[PDB]
Amino acid sequence: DIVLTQSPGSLAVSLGQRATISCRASESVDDDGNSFLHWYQQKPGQPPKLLIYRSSNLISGIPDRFSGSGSRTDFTLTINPVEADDVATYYCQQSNEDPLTFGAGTKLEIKRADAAPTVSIFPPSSEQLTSGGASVVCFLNNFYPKDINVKWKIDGSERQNGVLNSWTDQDSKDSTYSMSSTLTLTKDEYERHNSYTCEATHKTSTSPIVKSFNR
Amino acid sequence: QVQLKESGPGILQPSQTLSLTCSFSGFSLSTYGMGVSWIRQPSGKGLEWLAHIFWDGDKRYNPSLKSRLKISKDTSNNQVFLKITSVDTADTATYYCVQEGYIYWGQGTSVTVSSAKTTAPSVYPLAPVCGDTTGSSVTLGCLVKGYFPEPVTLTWNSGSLSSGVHTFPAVLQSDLYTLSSSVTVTSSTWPSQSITCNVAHPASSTKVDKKIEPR
């Protein structure tokens, strides 16, 4: 197989600046002359969109901000200036030899200032308790950057079993992240401790931003 | 200009056989240089090419998948079919069919290979047990535990409230998905104005309207 390796795997860029992406092939993807490396943009929900074909050729209608260079094994894709709707994943593809391979994808994410998460905690609604299961829910919302950490502490003791974590990607209008962390215990187990608390540590602090409720 | 559209079994038990059908318009598959590809995308993972058929009847198969695939055509009926045999669970993905040229892609259909049946979900409500973090706003929530299959549709106030809303993507715990949302309102809204969570899980006529009453 011809294996395509893309770097960067992730890209935080500001609007109006330059952004470069790279694809390198395990071998030449060329006849000799034209190359068979193309570039696809994939917006979440949609199919990949072909942008650039045979390394350098722009597909009709794509913005000229999109260019491709390279030959034989080393190819590069440039977006300049990045406008806010190129916040997408980019893939390269080779069609010199079957099987037809694509690379891992680079995703463009906008950069913005730090914002710390407004965490909030939810006990179990009675309803859940009546049917034998308890979920305590922590909402850590509207933060930049992505990387965050959530510790679930019960009575003060750490607890990792049964945490089910979820992120949103880039909130397009304000360029932020939100995350949902659910601890689900049994109603019986739940009824034997008084204190559920949820710890978040973000680049934006020297404290944990902690959230507690007693039963 | 051209249309491509897939048709899938929806859900499959492991170790069955997946049928896929690609319906098109815009080109007969007898036209010289015609052909149709099937590319496969996992959940939030890259692209993988699976197979390709050409107008002159020659088939192309992903050689690490060549075993389990078989492409075919009903050329006087604008149909390309795919059978992927012995469905393992690491075969849940989205199937795209693409006409030659790779410009024109069909939306893609989901297949999930889960040895489980349609469970309709419990929609528990999430209110604070008394406190006000944030700026004289409160975050509320809705917990949709334990369903199959994707998706549920959730709207706060039926779309009469969408700004300030986060709908965290569905994770799966016990082979059963768990989705969650939050809404931030100013305090003058709830408890005064009432906010209700609308969950709809169509594969089962589960249509659950859970109101967030303040405790």
């Binding site: 045979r54 597909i59 009709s60 069609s95 | 030659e100 040229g101 790779y102």
Partner: peptide
């Protein structure tokens, strides 16, 4: 052999 075509034309 042939080639799966990518790009226009």
């Amino acid at each position: 052999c042939k080639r799966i075509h990518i790009g226009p034309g």
